[PDB]
Structures are given as structure tokens and as C-alpha cells.
Amino acid sequence: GVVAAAEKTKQTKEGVLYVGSKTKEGVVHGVATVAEKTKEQVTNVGGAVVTGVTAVAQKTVEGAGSIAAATGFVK
Amino acid sequence: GVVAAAEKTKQTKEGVLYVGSKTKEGVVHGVATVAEKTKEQVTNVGGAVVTGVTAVAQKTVEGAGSIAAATGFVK
Amino acid sequence: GVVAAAEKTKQTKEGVLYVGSKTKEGVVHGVATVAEKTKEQVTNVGGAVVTGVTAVAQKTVEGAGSIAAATGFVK
Amino acid sequence: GVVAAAEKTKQTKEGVLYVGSKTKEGVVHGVATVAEKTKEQVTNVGGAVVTGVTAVAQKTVEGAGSIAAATGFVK
Amino acid sequence: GVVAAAEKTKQTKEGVLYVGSKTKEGVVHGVATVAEKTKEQVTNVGGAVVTGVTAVAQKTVEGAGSIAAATGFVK
Secondary structure, rough: EEEEEEEEOOOOOOOOOEEEEEEEEEEEEEOEEEEEOOEEEEEEEEEEEEEOOOOEEEOEEOOOEEEEEEOOEEO | OOOEEEEEEEOEOOOOOOEEEEEEEEOOOEEEEEEEEOEEEEEEEEEEEEEEOOOEEOOOEEEEEEEEEEOOOOO | OEEEEEEEEEEEEEEEEEEEEEEEEEEEOOOEEEEEOOOEEEEEEEEEEEEEEEEEEOOEEOOOEEEEEOOOOOO | OOOEEEEEOOOEEOOOEEEEEEEEEEEEEEOOOEOOOOOEEEEEEEEEEEEEOOEEEEEOOOOEEEEEEOOOOOO | EEEEEEEEEEEOOOOOOEEEEEEEEEEOOOOOOEOOOEEEEEEEEEEEEEEEOOOEEEOOEEEEEEEEEEOOOOO
């Protein structure tokens, strides 16, 4: 029942990017799931995750983008 | 029952980006799920997560973007 | 029953961005879910999360954007 | 029953952004869910979350944006 | 029941990128799942994860992109 459908039917400076970064110390951890003495952990990450000292996300979804996620359990 | 549908049907400086970043110390953790002595944890992250000392998100969803998420459990 | 539908049907400086950032110390944690001695935690994050010392979000949803989320449990 | 639908049907300086930030110390936590000795926590965050020492959100929803969220439990 | 379908039916400077990065120390961890004395951990990461001291994501989804994910267990 977890359905993700994406359809795209298609019948000057555009999207131009300039980044200049100067970093001395950089610690980036991105997507992280840490468990200590944990019993029962469920984690889900979906989509676009842009992370860091200089993070730029230009025009992430120009067409069709669908994210379906059923996260959990049954007892 | 967790359905995400996206449809895009398509029949000068546009979206131009300039970033200049100068950082000495940078610690970025992004998406994180930490559990200590935890029993039963459910986490869900969806979409666009732009994070960091200099975070820029230009024109994230130009077309169709759908995020469906059922997060949880049954007992 | 958690349905997210997005449809986009399409039949000078536009969206131009300038960021200049100068940071000495930067700590960014973004999306975080922390549990200590917790029993039973349900978390859900959806959409666009732009975070950081210099956070810029330009024209996040130009088209169709839908976020559906059922977060919780049954006993 | 948690339905989010978005439709966009489409048949000089526009949206131009300038940010200049100069920060010495910056701590940004974004979206956070912290539980200590907690039993039973349900959290949901949806939409656009722009956070940080310099946070700018220009023209977040130019088209169609829908956020549906059923957050809670049944006993 | 975990179905992801993507269809794309198709019948000046465009998408041009400039990055200049100068880093002295950089620690990047990307996607990480750490468990210590943990019992029972389920993790799922899907989509585009761009991470690092200088992270740039230009035009991530120009066509059709669908991410379906059922993350969890049954007892």
C-alpha cells in the first residue's frame, strides 16, 4: 500500500549556480542514526538531504517527485 | 494506503544563484536520530532538508512534489 | 488513507539569489530527534527544512506541493 | 483520510534576493524533538521551516501548497 | 505493496555550476547508522543525499522521481 508514482510528460542564464566556500575546520555528519543501549529503533529518511558547511540546493524538483513512506511496526 | 502521486504535464537571468561563504569552524549534523536507553523509537524525515552553516534552497519544487508519510505503530 | 497528490499542468532577473556569509564558529543540528530513557517516541518531519547560520529559502514551491502525514499509533 | 492535494494549471527584477551575513558565533538547532524519561511522545512538523542566525524565506508558496497532518493516537 | 513508479515521456547557460572550495580540515560522515549495545534497529535512507563541507545539489530531479519505503517490523 506504500505507492509512490511520478509522471512527467513534456510535449540567458537558466539555473546557473556560483558557490565560493573557504573553510578552516568542517565537521559534517549528514544523515545519522545513533542508538546506545536502545532496544527497538525504526528510522526512515527520504528525499533530498543537502548538508554541510556550505549547502546549496538549487531547483531540487523541476519535474515530478513523490516520496511515500510507511515507518513503524505492528505488535 | 500511503500513496504519493506527482504529475507534471508541460505542453535574462532565471534561477541564478550566488553564494560566498567564509567559515572558520563549522559543525553540521543534518538529519540525526539519537536514542540512549530508549526502548521504542519511530522516526521519519521526508522532503528536502538543506542544512549547514550557509544553507541555500532555491526553487525547491518547480514542478509537482508530494510527500506522504504514515509514521507510527499498532499494538 | 494517507494520500498526497500534486499536479502541475503548464500549457530581466527572475529568481536570482545573492548570499554572502562570513562565520567564525557555526554549529547547526538540522532535523534532530533525541530520546534518553524514553519509552515510545514517534516523530515525523516533512517538507522543506532549510537551517543553518545563514539560511535562505527562495521560491520553495513554485508548482504543486502536497505533504500528507499521519503520525501516531493505535493501542 | 489524510489527503493533501495541490494543483497548479498555467495556460525588471522579479524575486531577486540579497543577503549579507557576518556572524562570529552561531548555534542553530532547526527542527528538534527531545525526550528525557518521557513515555509516549508524538511529534509532526510539516511545511517550510527556515531557521538560522540569518533566515530568509522569499516567495515560499508561489503555486499550490497543501499540508495535511493527523497527529495523535487512539486507545 | 511497496511500489515506486516513475515515467518521463518527452515528445545561453542552462544548468551551469561553479564551485570553488578551500578547506583546511574536513570530516564528513555521510549516511551513518551506529548502534552500541542496541538490540533491534531498522534504518532506511532513500533519495539523494548530498553531504560535505561544500555540498551543492543542482536540479536533483528534472524528470520523474519516486521513493517508496516501508520501514518497520511485525511481531
